Each structure stands twice: as C-alpha cells, then as structure tokens.
Amino acid sequence: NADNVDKVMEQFDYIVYPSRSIKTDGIKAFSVTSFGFGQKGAQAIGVHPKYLFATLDKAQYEAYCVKVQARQKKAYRFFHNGLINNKLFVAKDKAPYEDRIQSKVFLNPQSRVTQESNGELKFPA
Amino acid sequence: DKDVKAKYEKYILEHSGIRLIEPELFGGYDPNRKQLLQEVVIEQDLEPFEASKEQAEEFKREHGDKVEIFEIPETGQYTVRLRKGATLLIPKALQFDRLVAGQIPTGWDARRYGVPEDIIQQVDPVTLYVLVSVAEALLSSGITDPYEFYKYVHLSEVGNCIGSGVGGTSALRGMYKDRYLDKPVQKDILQESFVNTMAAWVNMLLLSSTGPIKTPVGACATAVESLDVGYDTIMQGKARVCLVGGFDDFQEEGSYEFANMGATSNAKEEFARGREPGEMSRPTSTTRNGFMESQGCGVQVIMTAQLALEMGVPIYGIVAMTSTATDKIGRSVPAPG
Amino acid sequence: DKDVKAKYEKYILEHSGIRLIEPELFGGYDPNRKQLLQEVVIEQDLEPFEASKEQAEEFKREHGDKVEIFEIPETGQYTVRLRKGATLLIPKALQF
Amino acid sequence: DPYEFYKYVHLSEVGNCIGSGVGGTSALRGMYKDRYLDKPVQKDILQESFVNTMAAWVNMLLLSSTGPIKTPVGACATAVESLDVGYDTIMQGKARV
Amino acid sequence: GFMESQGCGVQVIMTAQLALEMGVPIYGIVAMTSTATDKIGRSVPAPG
Amino acid sequence: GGAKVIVTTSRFSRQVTEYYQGIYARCGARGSQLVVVPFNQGSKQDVE
Amino acid sequence: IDALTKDQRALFKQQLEIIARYLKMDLRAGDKAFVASQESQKALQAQLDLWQAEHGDIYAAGIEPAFDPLKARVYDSSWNWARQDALSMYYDIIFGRLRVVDREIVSQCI
Amino acid sequence: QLEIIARYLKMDLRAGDKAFVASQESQKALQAQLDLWQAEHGDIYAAG
Amino acid sequence: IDALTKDQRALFKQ
Amino acid sequence: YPFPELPDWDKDIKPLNDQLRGMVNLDKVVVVTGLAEIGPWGNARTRW
Amino acid sequence: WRRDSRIAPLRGALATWGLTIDDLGVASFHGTSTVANDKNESDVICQQ
Numbered sequence A: 001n002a003d004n005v006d007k008v009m010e011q012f013d014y015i016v017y018p019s020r021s022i023k024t025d026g027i028k029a030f031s032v033t034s035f036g037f038g039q040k041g042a043q044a045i046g047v048h049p050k051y052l053f054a055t056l057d058k059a060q061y062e063a064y065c066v067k068v069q070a071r072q073k074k075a076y077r078f079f080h081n082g083l084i085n086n087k088l089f090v091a092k093d094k095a096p097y098e099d100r101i102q103s104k105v106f107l108n109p110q111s112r113v114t115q116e117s118n119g120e121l122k123f124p125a
Numbered sequence B: 001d002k003d004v005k006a007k008y009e010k011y012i013l014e015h016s017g018i019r020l021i022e023p024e025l026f027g028g029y030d031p032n033r034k035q036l037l038q039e040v041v042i043e044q045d046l047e048p049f050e051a052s053k054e055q056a057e058e059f060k061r062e063h064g065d066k067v068e069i070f071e072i073p074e075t076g077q078y079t080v081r082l083r084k085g086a087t088l089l090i091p092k093a094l095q096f097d098r099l100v101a102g103q104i105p106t107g108w109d110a111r112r113y114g115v116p117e118d119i120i121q122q123v124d125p126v127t128l129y130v131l132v133s134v135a136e137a138l139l140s141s142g143i144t145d146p147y148e149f150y151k152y153v154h155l156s157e158v159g160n161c162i163g164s165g166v167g168g169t170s171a172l173r174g175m176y177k178d179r180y181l182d183k184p185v186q187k188d189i190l191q192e193s194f195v196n197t198m199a200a201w202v203n204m205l206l207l208s209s210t211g212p213i214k215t216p217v218g219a220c221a222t223a224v225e226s227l228d229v230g231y232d233t234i235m236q237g238k239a240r241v242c243l244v245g246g247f248d249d250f251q252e253e254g255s256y257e258f259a260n261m262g263a264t265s266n267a268k269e270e271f272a273r274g275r276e277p278g279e280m281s282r283p284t285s286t287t288r289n290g291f292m293e294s295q296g297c298g299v300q301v302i303m304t305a306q307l308a309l310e311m312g313v314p315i316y317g318i319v320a321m322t323s324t325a326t327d328k329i330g331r332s333v334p335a336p337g
Numbered sequence C: 001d002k003d004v005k006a007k008y009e010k011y012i013l014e015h016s017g018i019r020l021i022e023p024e025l026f027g028g029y030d031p032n033r034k035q036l037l038q039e040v041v042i043e044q045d046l047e048p049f050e051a052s053k054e055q056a057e058e059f060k061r062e063h064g065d066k067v068e069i070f071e072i073p074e075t076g077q078y079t080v081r082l083r084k085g086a087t088l089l090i091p092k093a094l095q096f
Numbered sequence D: 001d002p003y004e005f006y007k008y009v010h011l012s013e014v015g016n017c018i019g020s021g022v023g024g025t026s027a028l029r030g031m032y033k034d035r036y037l038d039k040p041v042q043k044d045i046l047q048e049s050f051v052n053t054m055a056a057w058v059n060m061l062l063l064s065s066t067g068p069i070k071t072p073v074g075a076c077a078t079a080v081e082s083l084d085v086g087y088d089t090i091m092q093g094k095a096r097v
Numbered sequence E: 001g002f003m004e005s006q007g008c009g010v011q012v013i014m015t016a017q018l019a020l021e022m023g024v025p026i027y028g029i030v031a032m033t034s035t036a037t038d039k040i041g042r043s044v045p046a047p048g
Numbered sequence F: 001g002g003a004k005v006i007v008t009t010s011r012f013s014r015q016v017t018e019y020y021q022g023i024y025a026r027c028g029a030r031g032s033q034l035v036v037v038p039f040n041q042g043s044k045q046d047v048e
Numbered sequence G: 001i002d003a004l005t006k007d008q009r010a011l012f013k014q015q016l017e018i019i020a021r022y023l024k025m026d027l028r029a030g031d032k033a034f035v036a037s038q039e040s041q042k043a044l045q046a047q048l049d050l051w052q053a054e055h056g057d058i059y060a061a062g063i064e065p066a067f068d069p070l071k072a073r074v075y076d077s078s079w080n081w082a083r084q085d086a087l088s089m090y091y092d093i094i095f096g097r098l099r100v101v102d103r104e105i106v107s108q109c110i
Numbered sequence H: 001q002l003e004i005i006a007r008y009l010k011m012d013l014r015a016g017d018k019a020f021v022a023s024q025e026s027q028k029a030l031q032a033q034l035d036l037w038q039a040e041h042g043d044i045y046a047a048g
Numbered sequence I: 001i002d003a004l005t006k007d008q009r010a011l012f013k014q
Numbered sequence J: 001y002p003f004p005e006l007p008d009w010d011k012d013i014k015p016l017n018d019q020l021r022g023m024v025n026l027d028k029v030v031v032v033t034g035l036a037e038i039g040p041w042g043n044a045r046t047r048w
Numbered sequence K: 001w002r003r004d005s006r007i008a009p010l011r012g013a014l015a016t017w018g019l020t021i022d023d024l025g026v027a028s029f030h031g032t033s034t035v036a037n038d039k040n041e042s043d044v045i046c047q048q
C-alpha cells in the first residue's frame, strides 16, 4: 500500500521503504519498534539464530540438531491429528501432582515429572 | 485438495483481511446504526402496564411523584403508570464513519481448535484468541504437553507475561452497560474484564506453573513491553521459560471512541477518495490519514538459550535487547515522542 | 491550634475511615437507589414531541415502522411520535 | 524538584512502574454507559481509562524522564507486582530511581 | 467478606548507591520480591 | 523522460490504481510525475 | 354482528368529522397533496422515458460522469523506487534472475 | 378526542402525509437522473 | 361477544 | 510442519565459531522458540 | 543465591544481610476478611 512515499521520508537516508518483497542472501539482525498512548515507547532487537550456535562446538550443535528434528516429527504428527480431530488445543483437567504431594512438590526445587504408563506426565508420589 | 482453491479462494479472500464490518462477528454491531438513548421527559401520563409487585416498587422508588402503582386485588400483580414529568429513554441510531475494520476471518472459532464448550461460554472472546494462540505457539516450539517443561524445569520457572491495552472489552461492556439495561449477564463478568484474567486462564488450562505473572498495560505497545518484561524476568532467575505476547479486541464502544480522538481513519471519507477497504491502510503514504482498527493477539514463547538447546526446541531468534521509554513533559497524552 | 481538636475532631472521625457511602463523593451514587433501566414495549402511540430535523431522523432510523416524523412546515422542526410496538426504556431503582 | 534526579542521573534512569487492577473507572463508565446515554462527555475519555495513563500523567507533569514504563495489572496484588517490576528493572541497569 | 475502599499508595525506589550519593532518607531494603501462579483450576478468584 | 502526465481511467479500481503505480515505480525518472484519475470520455461534463 | 356495530362506526366517523371541522383541519389534505405530487411524478417519467427511448440503456450508462478530484492519485516518489529497483536488481543478479545476457538488465539500469 | 376515535376506527390519520412524503422522495431520484440527461445534452438538443 | 364490546370499553375509558 | 531451517554448520556457522565460541553465557541469553498469532489474516502461517 | 537449588530465595535474600528466618519479625497479611484468603495466607506463610 505504499502509494507514494511522503517527500518527508526522503530526508531519512538510512531508511528505504520497499513497496515489494525482496529476497536476500540473508538478514542478521532486526529492530521492531512500537509506540503507545501515554508516551509508551518500546524497541526490541533480534539477532539471527546462527550467531547463538556459533557459541557451541560442532560437537554440541550437531547433537542438538538431532534432538530438534525428532521433535519436529512429533510436532508434525500432532498438528495433523489436531487439524483433523479438532484437538490442537487440549485443556488440562488436573495438575501434574496429586493434591497429597502438592506442598512438597512446591517446596523441593528438584522435583520433576516422569512420563507414565499412559504416556502422561506426572510427579512421582 | 485440487478443488479447494477454486471452490473457496474467492470467498476466503473476501471474508478475511481488512474488510467491511460484519455485524454477525460483533453480535449485531452495525456502524450504520449506532444505537444511542435520548432522555425524554414525558409530557402526559402514559398508559399502565402490569408488573410484579417487586418491579412496581422498583419503578416507584426511582420515580416517586411521577409514578402510580396499585395492586391488582385479584392476582397480586401491579400496574405502573408513569405520569407527566416522568423521565424516559428513547433509542435512536447514528451513521458512524468507521465502516471498515480488520477482523479475524469470517468463520474462525476457538472450538475448531478444541477449546471446551464450557470455557467458550465462560470467557471473553479475547481470552479465546489468547488461549488458542498460546496453544499453537507451544506447538511451534515443539511442546505438545506443556508439562514437558517440568521434565527440565521446576514449576516455578515457567512464567506468564501476556498483556493488553484494555482486554475483556466485552465483559467491560457487560457490566458498565448491559447490566444497567438489565440484560441477562453473568455474575462473574467482573473476572473476565481484568487484563490478567487472560493470562490466568492460560495457566488454569495448560501450564500449571507457580512461575511469575507480570502482566503489562502499555497500550499500543504492550506486546513489546511484554517481551521486555519476560526478558528481564528470565535474566533475573525468576523463570527459564516464559510466555509473552499482546492482545486486544474490536468493539463498538472502542471504535467509536478512537474516532472521537481522531486516530482512526474515516471510512466514508476514504470511500469518497476511491479507496477500497484494505487500500485503506497506507503506513508511509502521502495520503495516510489515520490508522485501522483490528483485532486478535500474538504470542511468542521465550527461554534461556541453555534450556532451549538442552530441551532441543526450535530457535527463531535471539532477543538481543529490549527497552521501554517515556518522552518529555507534555499535555498531549496520545502524542508519540 | 489548641481548639482544632475540639472544633473538628468529632467531624473528622465521622467523615473518614470505613463509613456509609456518601453520594456527593460519587456524583450521587446511592446504593439505596441503584438505578436500572427496563425495556418496555409501548402498547399505544404516545404523544408527539418536537425535535431537530437531525434528531428526528436518528429516531426514525432506529425505530422505522414504529415512528412517524414530519416537518413543521413553519420552523423546519420535526415531530416524533412513537407508535405501538415501539421500544422504550424506563428507569427503576434497587435497594443495594 | 524531581529534576534534581538529573543532577546525579540521566533522563533514561528515572523509571515509572505504577499500576492498578482496572484504573480510570470513571472514564470507563463514561464511554461504555454515559456515552450511550448521550450525556455530555469528553472526546478523549478513551485516554484516561488506560491503566498507564496515570503513569503517563505523572511523567508529563513532574518527571520528564526517558526512563522505562512497565505498568502492571495484577488485580488485588498489583502494588507488590509493581515493586517487583521496578526492582528487577533497576537491577538490570534499566533505571536507577 | 471484604471491604471496598479507594485510593493509591506509592514508594520511590533507588539503588542504595544512588541513595547514599544523593543523601536521601532510607526506609528499608527491598530484600526480595516475586510473583507466583498457582495450579490448574477453574475458579479464577480462588487464592492458591 | 522527465515527463509529468495525467492519466485517465474509466474503470478506476484498486487494481488499476496499483498497475499505474507498478509503472511509475519502474519508469518514473527524476522529475517525472504520474497522476491517475477516474474519467469517462463519454461525458461532456467530465471532459470540461 | 357487523351491522349491530356498523351503526357505531358510522356514528363515530361523523363524530370524528365534526371535531376535525371544529379544529379547522382537512383530514384528507395529506391524500390530496399526495395524489398531486404523484401526477407531477408522471410528467417526469414521461420526459425521462423520452431520453431512455432516443438513446438506449448502454449509452445511458456510458454518459455517466466519473471524474472526482478526491479520487486523484499522485505518484511522484521516484527517489525511493530508485533505491528499491536498485537494491532489487542487486539480489536479482546474485540469484540469476538476471543473467548478463538478458536485455532486461540494460533496461533496468537505464 | 379525535385521536382515540381514529384509533377505534382503526385508521391512520397521517397515512396520507406519510405516503406523500414517500412519493416526493422517489420524485427526486427521478429529477436526479433527468437532470443528468439535461446536463450531458443541453436544451436545444433536448428539444431537437 | 366480549371482544366486540371490549373495544367500546377501551374507547370510553380513554 | 516446518520448524526454522537449522543453519549449515560449515557454510554458515563455522565461519564465526572462532570469535564467538563460549563468548556468551547461555543462561543469560534470551531466545524465541515459539511463534503464533490470530488475526485478520489467520495464524502466523497464513499471515506470512 | 540466584538459582541455587540448596537455597530458598527467602533464605538467600535474608542471609545476604546476615539474617535467618528467625530474624523475620513481622508479616503483613493481605488478610482481606474473606473466609478463605485468611486461612490460606497463614497456611502459606506458615509452611514457608
């Protein structure tokens, strides 16, 4: 909808306003900026994933990549099941812990959930 | 599959995007008849109607001199006659200029996704967007059961920072208007008008976390302020994973209000300019005049890179920085600085 | 200063703290008459009132079948008569 | 004078984190009810119904700071959530006051 | 049941450093703060 | 060329608007200007 | 039935009339003025039907004015489309959408 | 008096004025279109 | 019967 | 159901590994792993 | 004490000034005079 960019915007050398999509060799970092009522200005800078991975050893990164691609296969499965059977959203009916355990679970920072015989996740009693 | 495109594309495009407001999507709102009420002072008695003894009293309480009520000795009913001088409210309608608004596709329902009927009935539509959103957002991140988080992390490290400008606009109307009008309305509508009730429902239905809940109201910018809040929260040990985003709905009362401020674009005037709904919104244009109302939410889940890699979840980007900023001294609240 | 306590204390304590709601402090709210509105369907025509041409239209827009408006050929004003079937709003009050 | 803060600190280090459960209840009514009733009502009432417009007015009248503004809605507990928010915000360099 | 009431409450907060440097009164140290959600439920108003 | 021209369309759409934009985006030399406008040459009134 | 009542109606209709007479108001003044305007609304459609006949529907359609200064669209922002078409071409080459051959590149460059 | 009698006789007194206003609206969409022909063609042509 | 007359009563009550 | 494209170690990441290895505390790096929306154009997928 | 599995954030924040839970003298309660919020509050602060 870039009819015709306002002549005012010419003076901003560092900004170029594209009226059509451009496929590039890549983008490294971006800046989103929003402003709000009552002097509410915010800005966030996001940087490309590769740069995080460059912290790791090919050893690590490649171990992770196998994890990811396994997840995607679960995800893929789920998403398709959901579309068909209208279950992309599943309401939980009970917390992970029986009420008996609750206070304890809350208070022990180690307590974690183990997969169960029915594929479900619960805290061990 | 091959036919889908032919059968439906035309419709799909016509009933999504920035389009003419569709009243069905808003319980009958039609900018072309904006209902108001005008106080009239009756200059006559008007004829009697029957009423319960209780209602009669109610009427007499409010009107006094200007109402007569008497028993029907036969059926314990009563009769209400307003007298001259009494005050009445007569509906009238207006032709509002904001005919166009960007609205969720004509047909979308949180039920297709699997939100339970009872929860559908109980909560503000806003929450429904937020619920579905967070659900699809957890999938995009490879989490099927949010409980998986509690394989790697303690209950107190999944955080919830979703906000909005004024969410629960339907419930809001329900208590400030629909209740005054004596229309059938929930007892708990107050619950669903709070900005953080959305966040609450997310936790009461999916993540049963004792994590933090910092929920922001940064008007047009909440969604970023939210990212910021979750960010800080995570880098202070409060949490390792964290839902973030913003939401807000489209409402008769909202749309009308923005128009009074001068922020939205006058559809009628833009139609006079040969514009089309959709050609309406031109961010950098010369002809740009005002913004476009729209609805919905947006969410991103966020984590420490460590927990991310350890879990083995997708990584879309690095939140390199966030921040919020006030401008100078002024008197124009809506002004950008 | 010495008198302050005697002149004002009694009042000051009575008009602060947890107390009976004081309508002046709330533009007239009085829990003892919680105003509502009830929809009534008029079962008669009710008499005409004058209105601006614009207002008349507004009324006719909302009511249609159930309202008649006509010019006053003399002052460009209009006349609004709601007809039987029209819908009205009558105030009532509650004891909260 | 709140400007004294700008003897020791930069405009961008005075922060504003005041919140509420649903503030601007009067303006709220004014637009959801008083307007429907055609009662005489401001054009900008929408402004004054936002939880953060309170915070805004504080900054537009006293502290002319380019500091942060994280404004919270934690219902009955906002006031503490607020303390928390300002706390974190300060311990992350975002602000000093 | 509880009692409705009205008004606000404010505290200004600083780094101890900036506090001492300025030379402003010190009423206390915010030693800790935190927010906490409870378990899965359906009662929104319930305390956990 | 650096030409400023006024173009008429008797089928003034968005699509038609966009089209002429597409043009000027790719032809509009320095100094040029495109001004599109609805018009019906079948109408004496329009002409004048 | 209806005759035991048709005296009533008659009685009241006369009632109504003499009251009107007293109030000095023509009851049929509305119907009169209506008939009236509905006659002039014929001399109209009369003349209108002439034009319609002498010229036909398509012509009738085709002479309808359509020019409106408010619908005018001005495109003049060359400076921007430049840097675009510039940056656009750059990547074009890097992916081979533009090969050095193609007359296209020439054109774009000009 | 007059009104309640009318009501009894089941007759709208203003039904005439109502229908009049009505036809006097359609008599505008007419003169509207008619004014077009008149404008596009002029008097002498109209005559001719 | 009573409806062929209930218009009367109505008329006169008014 | 596409996750984001994982970069190629050699072509894309290797070239920076030298400077950036262990140069960042992964427990104080904040990362977006999830994405979704509902709006006038649908979910983030259709919207894109 | 930041993220130490062996130190409650309460311990932590307190110990950093040379104090233990025993030094925690006054607890200000929400205590809203509602039936449940007052059981709960005590219960939480107590278990704590």
Ligand SMILES: NC(=O)c1ccc[n+]([C@@H]2O[C@H](COP(=O)([O-])OP(=O)(O)OC[C@H]3O[C@@H](n4cnc5c(N)ncnc54)[C@H](OP(=O)(O)O)[C@@H]3O)[C@@H](O)[C@H]2O)c1
Binding pocket: F008, F009, F010, F011, F039, F040, F041, F042, G062
């Ligand atoms: N090509 C040949 O061999 C040849 C030979 C002799 C003469 N010509 C002349 O070339 C000129 C261009 O025509 P063309 O043959 O190249 O293409 P064309 O297909 O005849 O183009 C006609 C154009 O005229 C516009 N138009 C149609 N009705 C109109 C109306 N009622 N009011 C205003 N504009 C209207 C339309 O533009 P919009 O879509 O924008 O409304 C349409 O694109 C004509 O004058 C034609 O006589 C061409």
